[PDB]
Design a protein around this ligand. Structure first.
Ligand SMILES: Nc1nc2c(ncn2[C@@H]2O[C@H](COP(=O)(O)OP(=O)(O)OP(=O)(O)O)[C@@H](O)[C@H]2O)c(=O)[nH]1
Ligand SMILES: Nc1nc2c(ncn2[C@@H]2O[C@H](COP(=O)(O)OP(=O)(O)O)[C@@H](O)[C@H]2O)c(=O)[nH]1
Ligand SMILES: [Mg+2]
Lengths: 431, 437, 156
């Protein structure tokens, strides 16, 4: 289990995907040139997981860039690390998706889907032992959502033995451009339930509320939100990119955090919260990080862990700190708060330590929770979907592209079936 | 020669294996490149250390050892470590994709891509043996390789070597160091499918070793290297009789005779004393009486349980160093004047004794002090059913909701195997209840 | 030559000039499609403000309901067309009209997070104790899904 193939689809997918490379690249000492100018060789021991080696002592991300709108490849190539992606791995159309899931899933995205698969096959046949795939996308748009779910399904059919893992941004009125997003997200969630092994729910509602109320940014920008997404994505993948034992590869993490196949939607969090460049702070200590890590205000999914029960939890501390300093605290959380961890999964909170901290901070902690409180996120989406669907608003947009009205009622029933499954295990007892 | 082949499976098995063979090499005066200047024989021989070491014409002593993992990370360290030149390079066998803490992957899907190669390599070792006794197998309970592949290997070794003995050293999981929540499942699954293929199995509770490292060696955060070294000195005490002249447990057959009255209840408890920190190099001698009495204090046990609340079926004392037999006999004499050690009706309520007068070896760079005398007590008591019960209770809680079961049925296993494995473990628990009045 | 169906679709599509022509030839301004929607319903759904306004100056029933009980204000408040919300209110839209799911315009504006439309509706006397047929008020909706911005606007 060595190589990971990263894919980014749509404007949100490619934007947050780019921020991911800019950040992990600097932790790994790779410059915009692919030349490694780092300061230690733990940055190299496991760099094959996300980078290919290009024979001139250069490093190339194992990344595929996809979007039906050509506008945003102009975008990414412009970025700080714009010119280190393989030009041949830019698969872009000219007609966009128009924020329409059906267009991305069925018509314009389906015309481009196997051009994308060709590049995935090229990447995968060069891997010694491919672990699986990592997709970054939005669920509220048309390309990231529609085509992204199509790509998941067809990648699944071609690589049934590998792990599929997604970083899915959920729509929110606080940040939204259109009212059709509950349609696109509800149609997307249906395919994520069936065809993904792990999904990180990065809720734009939570990202906005964090910037708006805790970091006191009057008008959050997309770049403000992505600063939080970049740090989360960097934290949750620390154990994949650095020598470790717990959660060391994509399948080992999945085996530990997913007790039931469909309940694989995680609620990520991260401490401390900084704003872009204002990060200089007092220090923070181990007891504080532990409690901020488990704090609702620190999650990037707009749900209260206190309103449900943890099925599994993964914690990643970063930086030079006392570890059993850490092991006293995270065992204290569990016994004082015994009622919020299910009794029928013993030892369901695992702790990892990585001595390499992120840029700008000497100590950090990342939270990965599989909580039954995640129902709140899907119930929020289900209510908006139903509100629109009951008045059948703008369904002509979807039917006109070759989709059926009963796929909407089916999506509605599958989201609600997911909701019911969580509440079933939230009330269950060891007995 | 009456050879013994050691097989190490999974990370825990491999890394414990490399600790042991390091220790063996020091006890037998073998150098990191295989050379032993203290050996008169030209390029071979029939000494007792030849049961564990083959000999080549250049005077190179080669472990009769196999290292197997389904990913290369750990075994790659053996290939490049201090003892890179000691082992048969073809006996270091790896895949590329591990079992992801999934018994079903280790025993059914991933494990069976490499099982036939593993057996052909063991055959090769067995074909260099004058009179192969059997195998010592190291593995963890909670790893997908440690549980699944190990169980698959034991089933195959039974078919191709029906005559030979098989001994287990199994790492019993502990939350302190546990990497996965499904370790209780894997523990039950392998125990069930392995029970009928193993003649005797020594469980090593990682929590017990963890506590000893903290309490006796004053180590804040025990590392695997810390636990391994301590474990490999307990393992050495148990295999010393096979590699040295002695009168107790001289071959694998005798392990069964002395420790296992009935085939199913074959998990002896090991207790080891003294464990003294290397910072106390000027500690005063502990007598035969004191280290013998320390073998009945729960703190020094390898598996957490209460022998005083159980009943003994067998007890063997393996002393090392400056140990006068008459002092041993008098130490036992007072031990049998303690009413809390009950024996079953149907067995001789005495203690078998062996003494190896070499002073115990400890690794340079370890955390243990050098001692003049040490003892490893191997006792088959019914108290060890408490350890199975702890695992069974965890198994029951998760399997009640079928948590994580899909991972297993998706990798070649039938769901019915859970319940039958748990029924076999329920039958084992009542096996212990029936033996213990 | 019935112009009702073509007035409906011109209003849906935002064809402001065709809207004026068709009314000039006697097109039924309160024509209904199969579901009971009127041109004003469809202009309000799709954000066609000037077609909303013109229909209101030529006899459109601002409080017409389709078979599901939806009024133009419902859909404008659901889709988030603030200017159209206020035009409809100045022409006497029933701010507390109830559809067949028990929803009022405030409920729909609350679900979809149209906070400015929430405030406009409140200033025009939206009933904060109006329950949907699950017994939920607009405030219950903001508590249940943790919308702190919406909850603060509703307690004022
Ligand atoms: N004493 C000791 N225990 C270990 C060591 N390494 C791992 N363990 C324990 O063994 C269990 C995990 O199983 P592993 O051996 O690591 O897994 P594996 O056998 O390689 O099989 P895979 O799941 O495919 O990797 C846990 O209980 C760990 O605490 C070690 O070096 N020494
Ligand atoms: N966090 C974040 N969300 C985004 C970004 N760009 C678009 N979105 C969100 O994604 C949705 C729009 O989907 P989009 O990616 O633009 O359409 P697509 O190109 O078809 O995938 C809305 O919910 C937006 O809030 C971004 O840069 N960051
Ligand atoms: Mg392993």
């Amino acid at each position: 289990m060595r190589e990971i193939v990263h894919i980014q689809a749509g404007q949100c997918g490619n934007q947050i995907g780019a921020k991911f490379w800019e950040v992990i690249s600097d932790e790994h000492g790779i410059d915009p040139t692919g030349s490694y100018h780092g300061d230690s060789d733990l940055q190299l021991e496991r760099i094959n997981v996300y980078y290919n080696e290009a024979t001139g002592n250069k490093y190339v991300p194992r990344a595929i860039l996809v979007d039906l709108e050509p506008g945003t490849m102009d975008s990414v190539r412009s970025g700080p690390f714009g010119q280190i992606f393989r030009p041949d791995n830019f698969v872009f159309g000219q007609s966009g998706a128009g924020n329409n899931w059906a267009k991305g899933h069925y018509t314009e995205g389906a015309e481009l889907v196997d051009s994308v698969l060709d590049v995935v096959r090229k990447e995968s046949e060069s891997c010694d032992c491919l672990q699986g795939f990592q997709l970054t996308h939005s669920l509220g748009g048309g390309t990231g959502s529609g085509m992204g779910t199509l790509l998941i399904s067809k990648i699944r059919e071609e690589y049934p033995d590998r792990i599929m893992n997604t970083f899915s941004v959920m729509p929110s009125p606080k940040v939204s451009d259109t009212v059709v997003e509950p349609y696109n997200a509800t149609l997307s969630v249906h395919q994520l339930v069936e065809n993904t092994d792990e999904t990180y729910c990065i809720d734009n509602e939570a990202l906005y509320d964090i910037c708006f109320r805790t970091l006191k940014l009057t008008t959050p920008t997309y770049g403000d939100l992505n600063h939080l997404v970049s740090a989360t994505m960097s934290g949750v993948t620390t154990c994949l990119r650095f020598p470790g034992q717990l959660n060391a590869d994509l399948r080992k993490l999945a085996v530990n955090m997913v007790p039931f196949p469909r309940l694989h939607f995680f609620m990520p969090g991260f401490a401390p919260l900084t704003s872009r460049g204002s990060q200089q702070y007092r220090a923070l200590t181990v007891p504080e990080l532990t409690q901020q890590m488990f704090d609702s205000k620190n999650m990037m999914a707009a749900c209260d862990p206190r309103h449900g029960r943890y099925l599994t939890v993964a914690a990643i501390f970063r930086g030079r700190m006392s570890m059993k300093e850490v092991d006293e605290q995270m065992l204290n959380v569990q016994n004082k708060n015994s009622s919020y961890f299910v009794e029928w999964i013993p030892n369901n909170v695992k702790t990892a330590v990585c001595d390499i901290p992120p840029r700008g901070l000497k100590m950090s902690a990342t939270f990965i929770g599989n909580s039954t409180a995640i129902q709140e996120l899907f119930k929020r989406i289900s209510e908006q979907f139903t509100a629109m669907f009951r008045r059948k608003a703008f369904l002509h947009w979807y039917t006109g592209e070759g989709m059926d009205e009963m796929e909407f009622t089916e999506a509605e029933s599958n989201m609600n079936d997911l909701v019911s499954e969580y509440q079933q295990y939230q009330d269950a007892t060891a007995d | 020669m009456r050879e013994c082949i050691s097989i190490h499976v999974g990370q825990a098995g491999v890394q414990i294996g490399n600790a042991c063979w390091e220790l063996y090499c020091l006890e037998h005066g073998i150098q990191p490149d295989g050379q032993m200047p203290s050996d008169k024989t030209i390029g071979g021989g029939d000494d007792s250390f030849n049961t564990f070491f083959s000999e080549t014409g250049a005077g190179k002593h080669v472990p009769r050892a196999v290292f197997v993992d389904l990913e290369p990370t750990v075994i790659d360290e053996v290939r490049t470590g201090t003892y890179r030149q000691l082992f048969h390079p073809e006996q270091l066998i790896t895949g590329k994709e591990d079992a992801a803490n999934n018994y079903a992957r280790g025993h059914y899907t991933i494990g069976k891509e490499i099982i036939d190669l593993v057996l052909d390599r063991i055959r090769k070792l067995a074909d260099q043996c004058t009179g192969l006794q059997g195998f010592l197998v190291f593995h963890s309970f909670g790893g997908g390789t440690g549980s699944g592949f190990t169980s698959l290997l034991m089933e195959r070794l039974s078919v191709d070597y029906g005559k030979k003995s098989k001994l287990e050293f199994s790492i019993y999981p502990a939350p302190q160091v546990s990497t996965a929540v499904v370790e209780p499942y894997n523990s039950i699954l392998t125990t069930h499918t392995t029970l009928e293929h193993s003649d005797c199995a020594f469980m090593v509770d990682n929590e017990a070793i963890y506590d000893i490292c903290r309490r006796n060696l004053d180590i804040e955060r025990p590392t695997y290297t810390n636990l391994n070294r301590l474990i490999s000195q307990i393992v050495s005490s148990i295999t010393a009789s096979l590699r040295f002249d002695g009168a107790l447990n001289v071959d694998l057959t005798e392990f069964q005779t002395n420790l296992v009255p009935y085939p199913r209840i074959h998990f002896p408890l090991a207790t080891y004393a003294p464990v003294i920190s290397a910072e106390k190099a000027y500690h005063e001698q502990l007598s035969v009486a004191e280290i013998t009495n320390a073998c009945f204090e729960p703190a020094n046990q390898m598996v957490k349980c209460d022998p005083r609340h159980g009943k003994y079926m067998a007890c063997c004392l393996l002393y090392r160093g400056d140990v006068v037999p008459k002092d041993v006999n008098a130490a036992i004499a007072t031990i049998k004047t303690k009413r809390s050690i009950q024996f079953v009706d149907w067995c001789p309520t005495g203690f078998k004794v062996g003494i190896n007068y070499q002073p115990p070896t400890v690794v340079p760079g370890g955390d243990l002090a050098k001692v003049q005398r040490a003892v490893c007590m191997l006792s088959n008591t019914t108290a060890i059913a408490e350890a199975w019960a702890r695992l069974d209770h965890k198994f029951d809680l998760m399997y009640a909701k079928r948590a994580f079961v899909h991972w297993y049925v998706g990798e070649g296993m039938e769901e019915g195997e859970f319940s039958e494995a748990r029924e076999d473990m329920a039958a084992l628990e009542k096996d212990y209840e029936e033996v213990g009045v | 030559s019935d112009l009702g169906k073509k007035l409906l679709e011109a209003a849906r599509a935002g064809q402001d000039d065709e809207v004026r022509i068709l009314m000039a030839n006697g097109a039924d301004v309160n024509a209904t499609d199969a579901s009971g929607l009127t041109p004003l319903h469809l202009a309000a759904t799709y954000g066609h403000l000037e077609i909303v306004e013109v229909l209101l100056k030529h006899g459109a029933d601002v409080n017409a309901i389709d078979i599901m009980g939806s009024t133009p204000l419902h859909l404008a408040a659901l889709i988030g067309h603030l200017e159209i919300v206020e035009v409809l209110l100045k022409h006497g839209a029933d701010v507390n009209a109830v559809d067949t799911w028990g929803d009022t315009p405030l409920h729909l504006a609350a679900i979809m997070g149209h906070l400015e439309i929430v405030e406009v509706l409140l200033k025009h006397g939206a009933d904060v104790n109006a329950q949907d047929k699950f017994g939920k008020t607009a405030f219950d909706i903001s508590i249940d899904n943790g919308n702190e911005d919406l909850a603060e606007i509703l307690q004022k």
